[PDB]
Amino acid sequence: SMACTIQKAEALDGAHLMQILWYDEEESLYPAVWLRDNCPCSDCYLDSAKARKLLVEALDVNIGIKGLIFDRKKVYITWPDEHYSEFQADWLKKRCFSKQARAKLQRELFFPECQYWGSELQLPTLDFEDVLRYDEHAYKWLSTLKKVGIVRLTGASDKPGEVSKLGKRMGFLYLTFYGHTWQVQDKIDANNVAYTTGKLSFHTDYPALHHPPGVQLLHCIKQTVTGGDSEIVDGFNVCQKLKKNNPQAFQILSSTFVDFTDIGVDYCDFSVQSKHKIIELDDKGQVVRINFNNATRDTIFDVPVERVQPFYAALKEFVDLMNSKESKFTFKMNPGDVITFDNWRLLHGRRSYEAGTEISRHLEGAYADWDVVMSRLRILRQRVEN
């Protein structure tokens, strides 16, 4: 391509930059120290690992290019200490330091596209066995999970072991104190409100951990007619609405560290404590995670007395917005359904149902880490586009 073909390469600015003029007349700049740091030769770079061997200690941060020649596809550089490097035009083009080039590459790496939703949600749905068997379907599954925050998979069995298959399709599941997988049913001496017939208001799972599960998988084995409907909301959409409608409540919830706790016995004995801001912003002010489960919020609340009541007032505004008919999407799982969802972004809940002498309702759940999921998504995209 004219865009990836070198018309001219030159050392500039005390030889501390290389400038490429592409055949399309666009220009790109590459710092000499970055080129040296990223020399792909066998001394500097371990090809079997696609990893840098060069040490920081080896890198002269004031380095300039000693000499440069080029052809249409490569640049060949000598360094002051006689080290010698070759860089490929396409590799350079991809890594161009312009804002537009860097942003393009970041989109390709991290799939940021996000579709916010409320009660109008058309629940994305795919077949379970299709997703296990076919990369095209597994790609649609994970890409949709990332973009929309939820996908329903239909046609699974009505037996345990289905979420474990999805785990393997991803890579591996995320072990917690509740096990590799866990059974959501009414239990005697329940160690968690989940394991009762009570209503679960909107929550994220596991804010008692400093790194809550990124992705949740929930498979319906048995459903009851007496209640137990599912509800979901898009936390990122709700947070946007809250910031606009009640900036005071938004500021409180995005700045106040709330203590979470979980003590008991399951996979092993545990005594877990964390602190999170309910609305967790990145350094640019964008909401990246919601951390909220009313069951596991501690009785311990580590704020001055005068900030307590305003916190609760803020929290109520947030919960009320989540409950609003424009925000929430309600549905009922049937046996063989699996929902797979972003546990950092969505909040989820369930309606109460009636206890009985045997088990009338049984879900199997598991977690996965977003890095594990994104890894699989990157691989699938390449396989499906190749």
Ligand X SMILES: O=C(O)CNC(=O)C(=O)O
Question: According to the 3-state scheme, what is the secondary structure of 358-378?
Answer: CCCCEEEEEEECHHHHHHHHH
Q: Give Cα separations from 221 to 9, 158, 329 (angstroms).
A: 64, 5, 22
Site for ligand NM2 in 293-322 (CB under 6 A): 293, 296
Q: Say what the alpha-carbon torsion angle 108, 241, 300, 208 is, to the nearest 10 degrees.
A: -30
Which residue's CB is nearer to a second copy, number 285 or number 304?
304
Q: Say what the alpha-carbon torsion angle 302, 306, 310, 315 is, to the nearest 10 degrees.
A: 10
Which of 162, 205, 262, 342 touches ligand X by CB under 6 A? 205
Q: Tell me the β-bridge partners of 125.
A: 152
178 binds, among ligand X, a second copy, ligand NM2, none (CB under 5 to 8 A by kind): ligand NM2
Site for ligand X in 224-253 (CB under 6 A): 230
* Cβ atoms of residues 365 and 219 within 8 Å: yes
Site for ligand NM2 in 154-183 (CB under 6 A): 178, 182
* Cβ atoms of residues 73 and 89 within 8 Å: yes
Which of 162, 186, 205, 337 touches ligand NM2 by CB under 6 A? 205
300 binds, among ligand NM2, a second copy, ligand X, none (CB under 5 to 8 A by kind): a second copy
Q: Does residue 268 have a known ligand-binding role?
A: no
Which residue's CB is nearer to Zn ion, number 2 or number 41?
41
Q: How far is the CB of 49 from ligand NM2 (least distance, A)?
A: 9
Q: How far is the CB of 274 from ligand X (least distance, A)?
A: 16
Token digits of residue 8: 């001219």
43: helix, coil or strand? coil
Which residue's CB is nearer to ligand X, number 64 or number 349?
349
- CA 334 – CA 128 distance, rounded (Å): 14
Strand-pair category, 6-12 with 27-31: unpaired
- Tell which residue, 143, 146, 179, 147, has the closest CA to residue 160: 179
Site size toward a second copy (CB under 8 A) is 89
- CA 217 – CA 376 distance, rounded (Å): 16
Which of 22, 139, 202, 206 touches ligand NM2 by CB under 6 A? 206
Q: Does residue 211 have a known ligand-binding role?
A: no
Place of tokens 């007395």: 305
- Tell which residue, 259, 239, 258, has the closest CA to residue 249: 239
Site for a second copy in 1-30 (CB under 8 A): 16-17, 29-30
Contacts with Zn ion by CB under 5 A lie at: 39, 41, 43-44, 205
Q: How far is the CB of 2 from a second copy (least distance, A)?
A: 23
Q: How far is the CB of 126 from ligand X (least distance, A)?
A: 20
Which of 305, 325, 358, 386 touches a second copy by CB under 8 A? 305
Which residue's CB is nearer to ligand NM2, number 237 or number 296?
296
Residues preceding chain discontinuities in the chain with C to N over 2.5 Å: none
Q: Does residue 114 have a known ligand-binding role?
A: no
Q: Does residue 44 have a known ligand-binding role?
A: yes
Q: How far is the CB of 39 from Zn ion (least distance, A)?
A: 3
Give the orientation angle of helix 235-245 with respect to helix 308-323, to 10 degrees: 120
Q: Does residue 158 have a known ligand-binding role?
A: no
**Binding-site residue ranges for Zn(2+):** 39, 41, 44, 83
**Which residues bind to ligand NM2, rule: CB under 6 A?**
178, 182, 184, 192, 194, 205-208, 293, 296, 365
**Which residues bind to ligand X, rule: CB under 6 A?**
184, 194, 200, 205, 230, 348, 350, 363
